[PDB]
Amino acid sequence: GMASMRILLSNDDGVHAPGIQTLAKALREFADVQVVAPDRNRSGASNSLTLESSLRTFTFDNGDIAVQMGTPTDCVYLGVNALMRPRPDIVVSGINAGPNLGDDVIYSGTVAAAMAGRHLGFPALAVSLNGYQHYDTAAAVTCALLRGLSREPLRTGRILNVNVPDLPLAQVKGIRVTRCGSRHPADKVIPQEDPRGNTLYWIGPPGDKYDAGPDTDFAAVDEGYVSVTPLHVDLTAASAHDVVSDWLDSVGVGTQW
Amino acid sequence: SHHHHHHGMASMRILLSNDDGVHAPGIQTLAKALREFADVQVVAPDRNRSGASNSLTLESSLRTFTFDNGDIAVQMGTPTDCVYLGVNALMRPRPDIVVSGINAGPNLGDDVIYSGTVAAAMAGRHLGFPALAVSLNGYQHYDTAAAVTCALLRGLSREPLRTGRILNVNVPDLPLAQVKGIRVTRCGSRHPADKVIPQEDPRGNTLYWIGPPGDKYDAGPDTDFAAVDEGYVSVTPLHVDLTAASAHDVVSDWLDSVGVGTQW
Ligand SMILES: [Ca+2]
Ligand SMILES: [Mg+2]
């Protein structure tokens, strides 16, 4: 093998998470792996980053780095820019306990850390397990993808979102390239009074599946396939361009006539 | 019947938020303009949360605080938490639309996915009018961004907009008379940001600041960058679907070719 793969490994659940430790161990059988991940398991970071403050890092004995109060984006950013020299070949984010599917992906810290590694020599991988049990399955799927990538370059697509059925490896049917499904709007709030009678509010669960058709990430994982969706960060909705332009003309906004 | 710039002093119910927080000049100038013709409820972060993007608070309940004028701050709340709570719990009657802004500084190109301004608008995408994110390319002409947003909202009152759930609006930092018009744009892109600014704490530990955005990369003629640089309001319709559809076949052929997850 002419060259070792050098991986920057991060996650949404922090350095202590079973998912990131299991992955790290499996990748280290063939690759050099630097962990740079949050100091703890926080929920709901998405792609936020810390701009109002500087960040502290801590290095463990095994060389793992925790960024203190770091988001997953902050971790990949420091890792790519300042803490690994030279820069990593690729960012791998995972294994996340829990699926990152459909229109949820924009809110996922696991996806966020991969999107921060989109400009490296390989497409970044975000790896989520549809459950909490078969980390070994997700780790073997990840190793298989990475072997694929060093065998033949993937030409287009800077981020792959990978969702792994929570199944023993022998039961996973295969791998499908998918698009993101969608959900109905989330609408539940759960109010709870504090001891003084003040109402506080919890964000409720996601809305029901809407677009879960045959070509979606939801469908593939349901049928026991690995789902691979390529993602990009361009939010432009190009199909709306003519409608919006026509509308502006019609209501006279930006025209005198 | 009577000739005024706007018909109705409260003809639409607006949930107004931002990521700069309730005390920011951009949201306070926008609130004051909007209240001339709309029924406005501010629900915004208790402080500046630039950097919050689409993050939300899941492992903790949120507490709200209501100011004398009725503005609501969500304590520790992100822009997404503010809109989600405003819409689903706090407002009665529910809003017809979410407006988020005016942000101090632009939200252009591939930065839009990192913007808390944009995230609040995207949490309002399911309402009857498309949500607006409004950002000023500068810090001076909040007045100009407010006039532009009021023009869009009067427009929505004349005629509903059919497709496009979220409009990302960037306004040049110019007097209104100097703004050239409006273009419907696409997001351009930047080089990766690459700077990390170290700074020692008083005990001699090294702390790190995230550096500024990378250089412009794709600022083509129909980009939001180009529009604003040329003195035009940029309007880009946005969606939340991250699927790189134009990569599907290539990824699919690559898989078949390396045979990952196949037997043979
Ligand atoms: Ca801001
Ligand atoms: Mg997680």
| Contact state of B255 with A148 under an 8 Å Cβ cutoff | yes
Nearest-by-CA chain B residue for A169: B261
Contact: A77, B114; criterion CB under 8 Å: no
> Phi and psi for A192 in degrees, rounded to 5?
-150, 125
Angle at A230 (CA atoms; ends A98, A108), nearest 5 degrees:
35
| E-strand stretches of A39-89 | 56-59, 65-68
Question: Which structure tokens are listed for B96?
Answer: 């017809």
Question: Which of B6, B55, B246 to mutate against chain A (most A CBs within 10 Å)?
Answer: B55
* CATH hierarchy code of domain B1-264: 3.40.1210.10
Q: Output Rg (C-alpha) for chain A, integer angstroms.
A: 20
Bond preceding residue B102 cis, omega within 30 of 0:
yes
Q: Which residues in chain B have their C atom more than 2.5 Å from the N of the next written residue, marking a break after them?
A: none
The 10 Å Cβ neighbour count of residue B243 is: 21
B164 to A230: CB separation less than 8 angstroms, yes or no: no
CA dist B130 → B126, B235, B260 (Å): 8, 12, 42
Q: CA A178, A184, A190: angle at the middle one, nearest 5?
A: 125
Neighbours of B89 (CB within 10 A): 22
User: In angstroms, what separates the C-alpha of A172 from chain B's closest C-alpha?
Assistant: 9
Q: CA of A149: which chain B residue's CA is closest?
A: B258
- Assign residue A200 a region: left if phi > 0, alpha if psi is -120 to 50, beta otherwise? beta
Please report, for chain A, the start and end positions of each structural domain, with discontinuous segments joined by +: 1-257
Experimental method: X-ray
d(CA A102, CA B199): 40
What letter would DSSP give residue B37?
T
Q: Say if CB B148 and CB B177 are below 8 A apart.
A: no
**Rounded distance between C-alpha atoms, residue A133 and residue A98, angstroms:** 10
Q: Identify the architecture of domain A1-257 in CATH.
A: 3-Layer(aba) Sandwich (3.40)
Q: CA–CA separation, B143 vs A215, rounded Å?
A: 47
Dihedral (Cα; B89, B16, B136, B120), 10-degree rounding: 10
* Alpha helix ranges (H) inside B69-197: 79-85, 116-123, 142-158
Q: Does residue A86 belong to the interface with chain B, where contact is any CB pair within 8 Å?
A: no
Contacts of A194 (CB under 8 A, 6+ apart): A200
Burial class (CB in 10 A: 0-12, 13-18, 19+), B37: buried
Residue A229, CA atoms < 13 Å, CB-side half-sphere: 30
* Neighbour tally for B240: CB within 10 Å: 22
B209 touches chain A (CB under 8 A): yes
CB count, 10 Å around CB of B112?
27
Name residues 13-42 of chain A within 8 A of B (Cβ).
42
